């Protein structure tokens, strides 16, 4: 509805401006530096480089704009730079589309053109990032799972040392058996004059729990190699003729290793995957109810705000559930669990929000002709939703009002020591688990309606363009990376953008059909092209993202690695 | 039709008996030993062990029956033994089915039970065969493709030696660049008093062609390692970040290497695959015409013989085309090209013969009720077809009348030397390229009609049971293996038997539906079970067939390998 649409844009716009003014004002106050420039503070940099102490209100835009991809990588990592490739690839595609705005072929060609070049670019970026990388513990290690039980008279450790030494008698350093939840919990309590008495009791509990952990057969271990080349090859090889025994993959970064899942055996992993995938499919079906609510609501005070707020509230609970469920499948690493969570989220983005909202909306208003006319009207909801996210969402992301309020309240009433005050402002990472899925939803909708309800394209341009600028500022000044996946996220993104294009092509095949267009058939070739394109891109670039190439593993060492430090890096609670 | 059915069984039966009597008579004559016992002759064994020179006419049955799988492997190879696993797995499944003959669940459970145990058995058989294997050239080598062109000033060989030495500086022995069709053709002519003058001219042509070959950049090479472990690992690893450069796989057995395809670049391979797969799909569509002919024909003199003869004639031309097309895709090895040919054949077995004959037959005679009643009648054609193959087909396979006639005519009129006489009787191999696809067709039909037209099950039992006995005799006395794939064929077979079961379950879901059975829905769980079963079997056993496990590669050597002989083994035309 038009009136409600303008009201929502108006409210989101004004809130955006207010937040922009609070940002301009508050970000120039030194007392808020822990909130507005924590990445620079943690890295030992001045909050800003002007030095005059009279910062121009638009200085941040100039700084964000005159910053190259290389500066983003040098300061915040490859994954961070890849996130910007994603945002600009999309912006380039939509801007090209709007220059023209039949258009289906234009968009598909532009999309294929940019995905081809973007995948090529990231593959190059990643290769260079790996090429200059320093010595890290995960470069020398593999994760071994599904070990069989040892024979009587031998323990689990001895058994694994024996197995690997026979295969790799020279290039074998250590095996750390993945043994202890009670100990971890009690130890945490111990780490945390009645308080002193409580601490003593907690320490005693930790000792008891540690004894139980010592008593505990295990089925997994982390194995270390003396060289990058050997580890790279070991992780790629079959160790037993029995596929289900002693299975080997590359070890996750120490910061990413999900220790609690390492002793889940292959078949238990298979069972968990089927029950979890099943559970998720069931969850998707229950989410049809919250979606029906959002679509049914779409007087002004509710239409302009409630459909969007409710959709945000229900979807906001998914990342927590989905990441939990992914960890529960037996996944060994945090970045994989995150990609998996994003994968599950995507299925909600497609079946509950794009399809769900669109269909439910269509069903509330010559049947085929009616449906064809009704479909484009759902775009107004989506234009509002997208604007809400780029005006208020980015308004809050840039102004950091919520973190600022919480921080000052903790500093004044709860924090007693300097350490507590610093914990209160630690910025966290970019939350790829919620951020990428968010952007993927915007793309799904913008692509799907790009030639049905074309104004959405401008909103898509602003969302991605403004996001580029807002997040470029946050990437440089606020967030701190928690793990480095080296662009391993890109193939996830590539496949989902291409999937969105695929869905678009399928939708236009059907929509042109709804309008009974004689030549809908000409889009079948695009549907086929998308599948072939995907296949070819996978054949040309994909494997380069799963493994470090031996030509990279074989790089000249700056110095010999200390394998003992490498080993220590993987021992929790010590 | 019943009369024609009995006539075909009668004729096939009598021909079978005549061929069995000719076999009994002729196989006891010493002059035919080169035809009836060539495997034993080539191996230096007496044609038969009785020594009395008075062989019992049924002695061959006793010998074929009291022969274990181990004796088949020891004499004729693993692939040969696997072929027998295939035949007996199927026999066990059908015999169990006939004990009961709702039945859909019985059959599916028996089938899952036997496939599980058969896959387990073969995996064990294969592992043992690899475990006791001797030193062979393919155990120490990889095939490298899609090499980039060298920089100016360096040649292709130098460029590959440089690339691999940097990655594997110690475990690197040789690189044989895959350089020469004109030379091969002219050399063959040279190898083959006007005849002396012709030979001299052919030798001159060979020299000229050799010079042209010497002049010839290349994109592939065979690389040798100093150890089984290193080769096994190299073949499993990524060498470049650019996926399409320097791609590496395990080298094919020297006897299997399809040299003409090694210089086809990745993207040309991708193009060839799409055009070839396309061509094959088109061929499948043109084959619908020969099928329509066969079904339309199905007075007595034609009904009893022509539908079957024509079907045999048209299908008989496929193995030649399909193997050619597979080689044309850029496949590096003969056993892979054969599996690929069998794969393509399977699609004809499914779309041109099972579906094609069944559908066309149904269309030549309350629509759903009519179709349900009509479908089972096609089984009579198939019972005839199967009996034709086990009575006349096996009759000829055992009696070897055609090879015998040709052999004696060559020996008497064309062969002048002893060498020519021996060439005339060389038995060849088991022709897995035509033999496995043949048996797969019988299974597709027997499974699909096992509860629709149940008598087919008895014919299926006889086909596989009698084939076991007839081919057990041929496996021990007649055929000579041309390559050894070590059971690599089994996953092809497993997946196709399971695919046949899957098709059966889909067909019964539909057929029970055709009879408007209330509980057709209960078969959906079997369809799902089949897919999960496949997935689980793949996860548990499959990888063990793609690579030799490092625990096997690491077996103690009897003696150090001669790497130079290993290298020579891969050089054609020298
Ligand atoms: C009828 C339609 C009329 C015309 C079309 C409509 C809208 C166009 C919108 C944006 C410009 C297109 C950029 C394509 C880049 C693809 C390749 C790549 O990846 O670019 C990247 C990223 O550049 C970008 O996007 C920058 C985006 C800037 C933020 C604001 C954007 C607009 C949002 C507000 C509302 C819309 C106003 C539109 C006015 C025309 C280059 O790399 P970098 O990060 O190393 O350098 C970064 C820059 N240095 C070289 C100077 C260091
Ligand atoms: C209402 C229905 C009535 C009853 C059911 C109907 C028909 C039953 C047909 C055949 C027997 C079942 C064999 C299952 C084996 C599965 C596991 C395995 O793999 O077995 C294999 C292979 O054994 C076989 O099949 C042998 C087949 C023999 C050739 C003739 C078969 C019948 C064809 C003629 C017409 C039908 C007459 C039927 C009369 C009842 C065992 O291993 P091997 O090769 O090391 O030893 C080989 C044998 N040594 C241990 C002594 C060395
Ligand atoms: C009467 C009935 C009316 C129905 C009306 C609603 C119809 C729409 C519902 C659609 C349900 C979709 C369920 C399938 C997605 C859930 C499973 C799953 O999540 O598993 C897949 C892996 O693809 C995950 O792979 P992932 O771990 O992400 O890999 C990342 C790195 N490679
Ligand atoms: C108006 C129209 C009426 C139509 C009526 C007829 C309908 C039935 C026609 C069906 C056409 C089927 C075509 C697809 C098979 C051909 C491709 C192909 O061959 O490629 C696949 C890889 O699966 C091969 O894999 P492979 O090399 O065997 O691997 C072995 C070891 N892993
Ligand atoms: C769609 C764009 C809307 C405008 C949003 C940005 C508003 C920021 C305006 C900042 C102006 C601050 C001027 C203060 C000058 C001073 O330091 O005295
Ligand atoms: C529309 C405004 C709502 C949000 C409230 C804004 C008022 C400031 C809240 C943060 C308290 C810290 C103020 C700056 C302290 C300093 O001067 O260093
Ligand atoms: C219906 C048929 C459509 C076919 C369209 C396929 C278009 C090819 C895909 C884009 C490739 C872009 C290549 C860029 C090369 C480069 O700059 O490195
Ligand atoms: C169907 C038309 C296809 C051609 C579109 C031309 C778009 C303008 C040229 C852009 C060149 C820059 C490439 C950037 C690749 C990237 O980093 O994503
Ligand atoms: C909600 C439906 C759940 C479906 C669950 C399917 C899980 C299949 C698990 C197969 C386990 C195979 C065990 C093999 C053990 C062995 O033989 O070594
Ligand atoms: C209620 C419907 C639920 C349907 C869920 C289907 C889940 C299929 C899972 C098997 C597909 C292959 C995934 C492989 C993942 C891995 O490599 O571990
Ligand atoms: C919740 C139970 C799952 C219900 C849906 C069935 C899912 C079947 C998954 C089969 C995956 C097959 C992937 C491997 C391909 C192969 O067999 O070669
Ligand atoms: C004037 C009436 C105001 C009523 C609500 C104000 C506008 C709604 C903003 C609340 C939700 C904002 C959440 C957006 C950030 C996000 O995407 O999570
Ligand atoms: C009609 C089109 C439907 C569109 C939704 C497609 C959902 C699937 C998303 C892409 C899955 C990609 C699978 C490859 C493995 C991987 O995820 O890395
Ligand atoms: C509808 C059937 C035909 C469709 C065939 C589509 C094949 C296009 C796949 C993408 C390849 C792009 C290669 C670009 C390389 C270059 O020119 O630089
Ligand atoms: C379905 C089975 C039909 C029978 C087919 C097998 C017939 C073979 C009979 C051979 C008997 C030969 C007796 C000769 C005795 C002798 O040496 O004098
Ligand atoms: C129905 C018979 C048709 C086939 C012709 C069978 C007659 C024998 C043909 C083969 C010739 C060799 C005969 C055996 C020579 C020998 O005694 O060593
Ligand atoms: C509709 C649900 C049907 C489910 C049926 C699944 C039956 C399990 C598959 C057969 C497993 C046989 C295990 C044999 C174990 C052994 O002897 O080693
Ligand atoms: C649904 C019923 C399942 C049980 C069927 C029982 C069949 C009899 C037992 C056969 C044991 C021999 C296994 C041989 C496995 C093989 O080599 O293929
Ligand atoms: C009958 C239809 C045939 C369809 C043929 C599709 C073949 C697609 C081939 C893609 C080639 C990609 C070339 C990439 C070269 C490069 O950029 O390095
Ligand atoms: C006329 C219709 C023809 C349809 C042919 C479809 C061919 C699809 C080929 C791509 C599927 C993946 C095969 C991978 C084989 C490989 O690993 O080299
Ligand atoms: C003859 C032209 C082919 C026409 C039919 C289209 C075949 C598309 C094949 C796509 C294979 C995709 C396999 C890789 C899966 C992925 O993209 O992750
Ligand atoms: C009495 C009339 C005889 C007419 C034809 C005789 C029976 C037909 C046999 C000829 C075809 C035999 C081919 C079967 C072997 C095969 O499967 O290739
Ligand atoms: C409705 C069921 C149709 C039955 C025909 C199925 C045709 C596909 C045959 C099996 C393909 C297996 C693919 C896995 C890769 C491989 O072949 O090794
Ligand atoms: C219809 C949904 C449920 C179907 C689930 C089917 C799972 C069966 C997969 C085969 C596993 C057989 C494991 C046998 C191991 C053993 O007991 O020895």
Author numbering:
A (entry chain A), B (entry chain B): 2 to 102, 154 to 231, 234 to 246, 280 to 303, 307 to 388, 410 to 476, 489 to 697
What's the paper's own text on this?
The dimeric two-pore OSCA/TMEM63 family has recently been identified as mechanically activated ion channels. In our previous work, we identified OSCA/TMEM63 as a conserved family of MA ion channels spanning several eukaryotic clades and having considerable diversity in the plant kingdom, where species commonly have more than one paralog. Similar to the TMEM16 family, OSCAs are dimeric and each subunit has a pore lined by transmembrane helices (TMs) 3–7, instead of a single pore along the symmetry axes. A hydrophobic gate on the extracellular half of the pore blocks ion flow.
Here, we used cryo-EM to determine a high-resolution structure of AtOSCA3.1, the first reported OSCA gene, in nanodiscs. Purified protein was then reconstituted into nanodiscs and subjected to cryo-EM analysis, resulting in a 2.6 Å resolution symmetric reconstruction sufficient to build a model of the majority of the protein (537 out of 724 residues) Due to increased flexibility of the BLD relative to previous OSCA structures, we were unable to assign residue identity, and instead modeled it as two poly-Ala helices. Overall, there is good agreement between OSCA3.1, OSCA1.1 and OSCA1.2 protomers (Cα RMSD OSCA3.1-OSCA1.1: 1.243 Å, OSCA3.1-OSCA1.2: 1.152 Å). The pore profile of these OSCAs is maintained and the small radii towards the extracellular side suggests these channels are in a closed/non-conductive state, as suggested by previous MD simulations. Likewise, the two π-helical turns in TM5 and TM6a seen in previous structures near the neck of the pore are present at similar positions in OSCA3.1. We identified multiple lipid-like densities in one of our postprocessed maps. Notably, one of these densities is located at the pore fenestration, at a position similar to that observed in previous MD simulations of OSCA1.2, supporting the proposed occupation of the pore pathway by lipids. Lipids were tentatively modeled as palmitic acid (green), phosphatidylcholine (cyan), and lyso-phosphatidylethanolamine (purple). However, the inter-subunit cleft in the nanodisc structure is wider due to outward movements of innermost TMs ranging from ~4–8 Å relative to the digitonin sample, which was recently denoted as an ‘extended’ state. Thus, our nanodisc structure represents a further ‘extended’ state than the one found both in digitonin and LMNG micelles.
